[PDB]
């Protein structure tokens, strides 16, 4: 049992999976991604967290993050926009899920790697740790 003297946070978005909600027909068909994170920062409640999130979850999370940022008196810090909305069709194709995944991975590492967010953002911890975000 050795604790890393330095604070750290490693995060990745991968392992995409497409689901059939009622298991019978395409109604509500959707793709979610797994966010895996390892950290020792005082804001977090466990070392390793593994959760799954939908793109709209990320979209919802971004609104929350941006608003929280404003309430913590940091009117000059900015959150990069997410990869982007996509047309229903190709939306479930391989190449599309892959590019969006890479986009989400990059976006997440950038957001979670920000000093101010790591120490003061409650929303960031919740997005990374809760079973369901909503």
UniProtKB/Swiss-Prot annotation:
**Topology within the bilayer:** Peripheral membrane protein
One biological process term in Gene Ontology: endocytic recycling
Does the keyword section mention Ribonucleoprotein? no
GO cellular component terms given for this protein? cytosol; early endosome membrane; endosome; fungal-type vacuole membrane; Golgi membrane; protein-lipid complex; retromer complex
The residues listed in the UniProt record as binding a 1,2-diacyl-sn-glycero-3-phospho-(1D-myo-inositol-3-phosphate), with positions renumbered to this chain, are 54, 56, 85, 100
Instruction: State what the entry records as the consequence of deleting this gene.
Output: Abnormal retrograde transport to the Golgi apparatus with proteins missorted to the vacuole. Sensitive to neomycin and trifluoperazine; sensitivity is suppressed by knockout of ANY1.
Domain (PX) ranges: 11-134
Where it sits in the cell: the answer is: Cytoplasm; Golgi apparatus membrane; Prevacuolar compartment membrane
Q: Which UniProt keywords apply?
A: Cytoplasm, Golgi apparatus, Lipid-binding, Membrane, Protein transport, Transport
An MF annotation (GO) of this entry: phosphatidylinositol-3-phosphate binding
Main localisation, per the record?
cytoplasm
**Similarity remark:** Belongs to the sorting nexin family.
On assembly, the entry states:
Monomer. Interacts with RBD2, YIF1, YIP1 and YIP5.
Role according to the record:
Required for retention of late Golgi membrane proteins. Component of the retrieval machinery that functions by direct interaction with the cytosolic tails of certain TGN membrane proteins during the sorting/budding process at the prevacuolar compartment. Binds phosphatidylinositol 3-phosphate (PtdIns(P3)).
Mind telling me what this protein is named?
Sorting nexin-3
Question: Whose protein is this, by species?
Answer: Saccharomyces cerevisiae (strain ATCC 204508 / S288c) (Baker's yeast)
């Amino acid at each position: 049992i050795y604790a890393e003297p330095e604070n750290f946070l490693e995060i990745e978005v991968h392992n995409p999976k497409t689901h059939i909600p009622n298991g019978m027909d395409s109604k509500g068909m959707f793709t979610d991604y797994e966010i895996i994170c390892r950290t020792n920062l005082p804001s977090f409640h466990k070392r390793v967290s593994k959760v799954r999130r939908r793109y709209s979850d990320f979209e919802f999370f971004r609104k929350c993050l941006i608003k929280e940022i404003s309430m913590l008196n940091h009117p000059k810090v900015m959150v990069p926009h997410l990869p982007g909305k996509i047309l229903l069709s190709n939306r479930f194709s391989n190449e599309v899920i892959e590019e969006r995944r890479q986009g989400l991975n990059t976006w997440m590492q950038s957001v979670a790697g920000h000093p101010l967010l790591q120490s003061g953002s409650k929303v960031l911890v919740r997005f990374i740790e809760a079973e369901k975000f909503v």
